[PDB]
């Protein structure tokens, strides 16, 4: 009974919050990424990196606070507290955006710690590890968006900043610069997310409305017992209902529940692949054949051509303030505008 | 039995491969009318003067579009909320120019999709089920009413309804953000929580059930053959799944009642999508998302920009560029 | 020479056929615009 | 429209190659005892 086995005994004790070996990684990294986010959004400015106020201390609200990305001049510097940029000065580290990399890096290692927790608990209780496998999708999204996307770009500055409206800026940046709505990988993502919410809604509603009467109450939640062997709802009735309403229906409960794993997980993976492309500006920006035609035929107009003009407006009107390292001076006469507005 | 009693028994018959029903006698002609017209319009309709400014937009495949850029273009701004059926036009060529197909499609569609909801009630009644699948469907239904009907009504024109195409959808979204700041509206934010949470919960429930499947098969066969259609036994160990997920988080965070769990899976995306639909339908009356432009002011009075101010620049760029020849006066009022 | 005992029959049921074909046709319909460009 | 000259063959094979793969596996499943 060595010291490893006694430490393993303690880490795997049945307690209120299970720890585990993964908890050594997970619990400090998650706490710091969470705590770094609250600290930065409560007290930390973005004045020197972005020229923005981003904290409750400066007057922002929950929608507008953020821990913003470091300055573009930092490149992809790890921005360690002891690194050559902050030189151990905590105050300067906060001013240079070191909390962004702190949250991103500890968030990354925490997410690893969380998937390791999923494996560890599934192995201890004796279930298959599909929940960890399904968690690969949010990890793939986090890694592609928060790490691979800025690594492909000029600096961490162009990553998403950890804030509500800051994320909204990230969304509108991707429309205006990348035409990301046109990207078939994003479209697959949308289908997986919306298809996932549909399956969530329809499966929940189908189970609740094909329940067997297992008790006398009109509120039907009491009629379930977790030790029952019997199905609590009628798969046969559900199948007949959906086959007659929609044409097709599930008839295998295992395939149904796998498909529910598969749909949102595949969608998020597809979107991650699209974002990796956008790291290198490999956009699905334009359809070459329409651009050739629109250039030569000034009467050819489509919803795609209209969207490109919207995108040109986004870039011109947002770039001077969104990218203050560039020192864009766009005089009023160069800004694209339609008539009147 | 007379002919009417025989017909009623056919209509409400549970033995029909697809259930007709009384809602079905409306749903079927309306949806076939909307589908046929959509397919023909998407392939072959000539350009439509959406903005009422004699600047027709090409929406169909034959007129230069692909699957992604093609659309059924909304009816003309000159028509407004006026009902524009085929008989009101002097010719089909005029009906086509003014965007007649759009009004025909969305009206038949919305009538048809409303009856789809009723038909879901109807069959559940005929089958002895509980009746509330239709309530779940009322979330996407309300969303469709929001973008096709309520938004045009509050804005005063079916030209502001969402186009029936993929890039047309994106144009609708971008302009909407420009004009209403939808991202900063809490109803849209609840919509996002509804759909991200819904996809999350879909993944979670799928994964936990799949993880707890009881062994009935070997390695050389799909584990899905472990379930037989209409078997009485549970095919997964919900006590094992609760024992996992309550150790993943903590014990009281995890459902042990399958009925509660499935209600939550219903209620979360449905309530979230209801808020999304109400978001669109209330921005139809120009109650917009939060405006924090210049909310942060220094001691002198200098504007200190926030992330909301950066959003506003992007919003301005879409606003100044959208419908670039349609505006004659300084304020975009509807 | 004795036959190989690791050989296994392969199956694809009809619903899997319909699902796969749905998948392939929808990916085709989705990506076709990008392939033509 | 001036489209990619390889878009038709790319689409035709992207359809036909995995579709025939699934058809092959379906048909030989049905013919098993």
């Amino acid at each position: 009974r060595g010291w490893f086995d006694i430490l393993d005994d303690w880490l795997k004790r049945d307690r209120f919050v299970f720890v585990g070996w993964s908890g050594i990684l997970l619990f400090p990294c998650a706490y710091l990424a969470l705590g770094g986010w609250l600290t930065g959004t409560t007290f930390v400015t973005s004045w020197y990196t972005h020229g923005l106020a981003s904290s409750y201390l400066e007057g922002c609200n929950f929608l507008t606070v953020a821990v913003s990305t470091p300055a573009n001049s930092m490149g992809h510097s790890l921005l360690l507290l002891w690194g050559p940029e902050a030189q151990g000065d905590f105050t300067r580290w906060c001013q240079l955006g070191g909390l962004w990399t702190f949250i991103a890096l500890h968030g990354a290692f925490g997410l690893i710690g969380f998937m390791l927790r999923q494996f560890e608990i599934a192995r201890l209780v004796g279930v298959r590890p599909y929940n960890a496998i399904a968690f690969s999708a949010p990890i793939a999204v986090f890694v592609s968006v928060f790490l691979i996307y800025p690594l492909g770009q000029s600096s961490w500055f162009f990553a998403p900043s950890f804030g509500v409206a800051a994320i909204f800026r990230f969304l509108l940046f991707f429309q205006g610069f990348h035409n990301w709505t046109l990207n078939p990988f994003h479209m697959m993502g949308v289908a997986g997310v919306l298809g996932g919410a549909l399956l969530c809604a329809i499966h929940g509603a189908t189970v609740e409305n094909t329940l067997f009467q297992d008790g006398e109450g009109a509120s039907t939640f009491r009629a379930f017992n977790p030790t029952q062997a019997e199905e609590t709802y009628s798969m046969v009735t559900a199948n007949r209902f959906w086959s007659q309403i929609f044409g097709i229906a599930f008839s295998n409960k295992r395939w149904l529940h796998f498909f529910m794993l598969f749909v949102p997980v595949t969608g998020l993976w597809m979107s991650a692949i699209g974002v990796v492309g956008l790291a290198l500006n490999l956009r699905s920006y334009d359809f070459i054949s329409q651009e050739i035609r629109a250039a030569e035929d000034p009467e050819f107009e489509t919803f795609y051509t209209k969207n490109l003009l919207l995108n040109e407006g986004i870039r011109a009107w947002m770039a001077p303030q969104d990218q203050p390292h560039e020192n864009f001076v766009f005089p009023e006469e160069v800004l694209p505008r339609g008539n009147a507005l | 039995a007379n002919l009417w009693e025989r017909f009623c028994n056919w209509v409400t018959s549970t033995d029909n491969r697809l259930y007709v029903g009384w809602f079905g006698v409306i749903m079927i002609p309306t949806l076939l009318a909307a589908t046929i017209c959509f397919v023909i319009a998407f392939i072959a309709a000539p350009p439509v003067d959406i903005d009422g400014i004699r600047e027709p937009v090409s929406g169909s495949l034959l007129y230069g579009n692909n699957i992604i850029t093609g659309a059924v273009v909304p009816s003309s701004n000159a028509i407004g909320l006026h009902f524009y059926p085929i008989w009101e036009a002097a010719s089909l060529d005029e009906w086509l120019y003014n965007g007649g197909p759009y009004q025909l499609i969305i009206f038949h569609f919305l009538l048809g999709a409303s009856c789809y909801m009723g038909r879901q009630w109807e069959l559940s009644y005929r089958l002895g089920m509980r009746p509330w699948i239709c309530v779940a469907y009322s979330a996407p239904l309300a969303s469709a009413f929001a973008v096709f009907l309520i938004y045009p009504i509050g804005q005063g024109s079916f030209s502001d309804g969402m186009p029936l195409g993929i890039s047309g959808t994106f144009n609708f979204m971008i302009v909407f953000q420009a004009e209403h700041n939808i991202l900063m509206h809490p109803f849209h934010q609840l919509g996002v929580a509804g759909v991200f949470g819904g996809a999350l919960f879909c993944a979670m429930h799928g994964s936990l059930v799949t993880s707890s499947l009881i062994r009935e098969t070997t390695e050389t066969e799909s584990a899905n053959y472990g379930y037989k259609f209409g078997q009485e036994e549970e095919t997964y160990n919900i006590v094992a799944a609760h024992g996992y997920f309550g150790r993943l988080i903590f014990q009281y965070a995890s459902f042990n009642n399958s009925r509660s769990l499935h209600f939550f899976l219903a209620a979360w995306p449905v309530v979230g999508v209801w808020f999304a639909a109400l978001g669109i339908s209330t921005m139809a009356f120009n109650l917009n998302g939060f405006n924090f432009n210049h909310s942060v002011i220094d001691a002198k009075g200098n504007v200190i920009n926030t992330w909301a101010d950066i959003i506003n620049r992007a919003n301005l760029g879409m606003e100044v560029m959208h419908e670039r020849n349609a505006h004659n006066f300084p304020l975009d009022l509807a | 020479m004795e036959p190989n005992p690791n050989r296994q029959p392969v199956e694809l049921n009809r619903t899997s056929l319909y699902l796969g074909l749905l998948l392939i046709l929808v990916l085709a319909l989705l990506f076709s615009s990008y392939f033509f460009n | 429209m001036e489209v990619n000259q390889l878009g038709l063959i790319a689409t035709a094979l992207f359809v036909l190659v995995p579709s025939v793969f699934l058809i092959i596996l379906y048909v030989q499943t049905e013919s098993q005892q």
Partner: peptide, 30 residues
């Protein structure tokens, strides 16, 4: 060619709907 290709793929999908509905493997209670 483009228009024909898109309509062709679409028409196959509609056909697949027809077979998936009217020629499914019938759910059998066992």
């Amino acid at each position: 060619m483009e228009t024909i290709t898109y309509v062709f793929i679409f028409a196959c999908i509609i056909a697949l709907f027809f077979f998936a509905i009217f020629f499914r493997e019938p759910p059998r209670i066992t």
